[PDB]
From Swiss-Prot:
Keywords: Chromatin regulator, Cytoplasm, Metal-binding, Methyltransferase, Nucleus, Phosphoprotein, S-adenosyl-L-methionine, Transcription, Transcription regulation, Transferase, Zinc, Zinc-finger
UniProt KW Mitochondrion keyword: no
Swiss-Prot/TrEMBL catalytic activity: L-lysyl(4)-[histone H3] + 3 S-adenosyl-L-methionine = N(6),N(6),N(6)-trimethyl-L-lysyl(4)-[histone H3] + 3 S-adenosyl-L-homocysteine + 3 H(+); L-lysyl-[protein] + S-adenosyl-L-methionine = N(6)-methyl-L-lysyl-[protein] + S-adenosyl-L-homocysteine + H(+)
Main function: Protein-lysine N-methyltransferase that methylates both histones and non-histone proteins, including p53/TP53 and RB1. Specifically trimethylates histone H3 'Lys-4' (H3K4me3) in vivo. The activity requires interaction with HSP90alpha. Shows even higher methyltransferase activity on p53/TP53. Monomethylates 'Lys-370' of p53/TP53, leading to decreased DNA-binding activity and subsequent transcriptional regulation activity of p53/TP53. Monomethylates RB1 at 'Lys-860'.
Subunit structure: Interacts with RNA polymerase II and HELZ. Interacts with SIN3A and HDAC1. Interacts (via MYND-type zinc finger) with EPB41L3. Interacts (via SET domain) with p53/TP53. Interacts with RB1 and HSP90AA1.
GO CC terms, sorted: cytoplasm; cytosol; nucleoplasm; nucleus
Organism of derivation: Homo sapiens (Human)
Outcome reported for the amino acid change (mutating Y372A): Abolishes methyltransferase activity on p53/TP53
Outcome when changing E429K: Strongly reduces methyltransferase activity on p53/TP53
Modified residues (Phosphoserine): S281
PROSITE patterns according to UniProt: SET, ZF_MYND_1, ZF_MYND_2
Entries under SMART domains matching the protein: SET
The protein, known as: N-lysine methyltransferase SMYD2
């Protein structure tokens, strides 16, 4: 199945539908772009980005009716109106209690899009939204109850402005959205919004992917990070590649109900380094290691929950205490330590403790470089944060160096002409 040039849809043995190359692609080549089928700017970025096109700039004009949507100009505002009108009056009516989840917000837009544009869109050249996997038969009752709550919230916040299909159809759709929806992030991997990119959702998973997905406004772009030969399958990663094999496959199993057999998962080459044990005089016993791994996974999950109701200083305390406890057995380059160091850095940034955030960054960066693959956005984002921190604290040489490391990754991932790169070059001069 063809039309996107140089590519086709096919049946990948052992995996199912996928995407393969018909022509070579070199590192940094653009395979395809996919316009968003539906998308929504996250609430905390309102006023910083245009709701229609996601341009980040000053001096955006306001929707006069609700005062909660911002735009480059009246053309962006008018083009956004079919989607924005789903929320404009409801925000006025509900005021401070207007609070649908972002999943609910995105699903409302999908429904409006289906009504206005029932035919195949340019976002769906090889895979249609209706063909999305739901995994509905594999979901437990807890997840199905959350789907029913989303349906309830959809009705509650959007009923004046949408006609709904039946409960059965919404259950399928919500399940499809839960597992197919993408996040759009900025250059520091900060959350900007959510979107549906149907053609991107065709790609199968590898823990050594040969492409990387980036965003230019609401457009997804897919570039090669390894050489791809004619006839080879195009693989993205569905999950965070920092973690060792068991953890990667736990996340794959819980969200998509499969496990990976790629070369990384097969060989487990990076696993030993990822869970590095301190080389002490009396080395830690095997039991103690299992104990500390168990503790680490617990605190990682505990911390995920705790950030919905603890203060910044309490969160930093959990990070510090967990790091102290883990350091009896784990090296600082160990991925569970890096996890908590990364959370700590974010808490520091939130509190405007620039020095503290910088110190955490300096310890994270070299382990990141080794644990992630070559052209990782996680690595690039960390160099950029370091660079910006260094610049702000007047370490101009160190800052320039870090920003250059960011650029060298981003030229490949984002393309040399991406506006993010122009902005970062300006920071090196200014
Ligand atoms: C045996 C085997 N081995 C493999 N190596 C492999 N690779 C892919 N598969 C099959 C099984 N698949 C799915 O269950 C699937 C695929 C998608 C599309 N999703 C992916 C996540 N996508 C982002 C990931 C990035 C971060 C944001 C979240 C969603 C959205 C689109 N869904 C919702 N289910 C396809 C494989 N099977
Ligand atoms: Zn705009
Ligand atoms: Zn409005
Ligand atoms: Zn794998």
């Amino acid at each position: 199945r063809a039309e996107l040039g140089g590519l086709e849809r096919f049946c990948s043995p052992g995996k199912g539908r996928g995407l393969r190359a018909l022509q070579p692609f070199q590192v940094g080549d653009l395979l395809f772009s996919c316009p968003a089928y539906a998308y929504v700017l996250t609430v905390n970025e309102r006023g910083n980005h245009c709701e229609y096109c996601f341009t980040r700039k000053e001096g955006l004009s306001k929707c006069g009716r609700c005062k909660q949507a911002f735009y480059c100009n009246v053309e962006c505002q008018k083009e956004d109106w079919p989607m924005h009108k789903l929320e404009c009056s409801p925000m006025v009516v509900f005021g401070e209690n207007w609070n649908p989840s972002e999943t609910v917000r995105l699903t409302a837009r999908i429904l409006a899009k289906q009504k206005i544009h029932p035919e195949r869109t340019p976002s769906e050249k090889l895979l249609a939204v209706k063909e999305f996997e739901s995994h509905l038969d594999k979901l437990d009752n807890e997840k199905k109850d959350l789907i029913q709550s989303d349906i309830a919230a959809l009705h509650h916040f959007y009923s004046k402005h949408l006609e709904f299909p039946d409960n059965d159809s919404l259950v399928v759709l919500f399940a499809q959205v839960n597992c197919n929806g993408f996040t759009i992030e900025d250059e520091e991997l900060s959350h900007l919004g959510s979107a549906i990119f149907p053609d991107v959702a065709l790609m199968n998973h590898s823990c050594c992917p040969n492409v990387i997905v980036t965003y230019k406004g609401t457009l997804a772009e897919v570039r090669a990070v390894q050489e791809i030969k004619p006839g080879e399958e195009v693989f993205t990663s569905y999950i965070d590649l920092l973690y060792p094999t068991e953890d990667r496959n736990d996340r794959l199993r819980d969200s998509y109900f499969f496990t990976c057999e790629c070369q990384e998962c097969t060989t487990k080459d990076k696993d030993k380094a990822k869970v590095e044990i301190r080389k002490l005089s009396d080395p830690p016993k095997a039991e103690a290691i299992r104990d500390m791994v168990r503790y680490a996974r617990n605190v990682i999950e505990e911390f995920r929950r705790a950030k919905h109701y603890k203060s910044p200083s309490e969160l930093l305390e959990i990070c510090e205490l967990s790091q102290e406890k883990m350091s009896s057995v784990f090296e600082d380059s160990n991925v569970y330590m890096l996890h908590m160091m990364y959370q700590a850095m974010g808490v520091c940034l939130y509190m405007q403790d620039w020095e503290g955030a910088l110190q955490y960054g300096q310890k994270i960066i070299k382990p990141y470089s080794k644990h992630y693959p070559l052209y990782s956005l996680n690595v690039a984002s960390m160099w950029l944060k370091l660079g910006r921190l260094y610049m702000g604290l007047e370490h101009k040489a160190a800052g320039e160096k870090a920003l250059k490391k960011a650029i060298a990754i981003m030229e490949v991932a984002h393309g040399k002409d991406h506006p993010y790169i122009s902005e970062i070059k300006q920071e090196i001069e200014s």
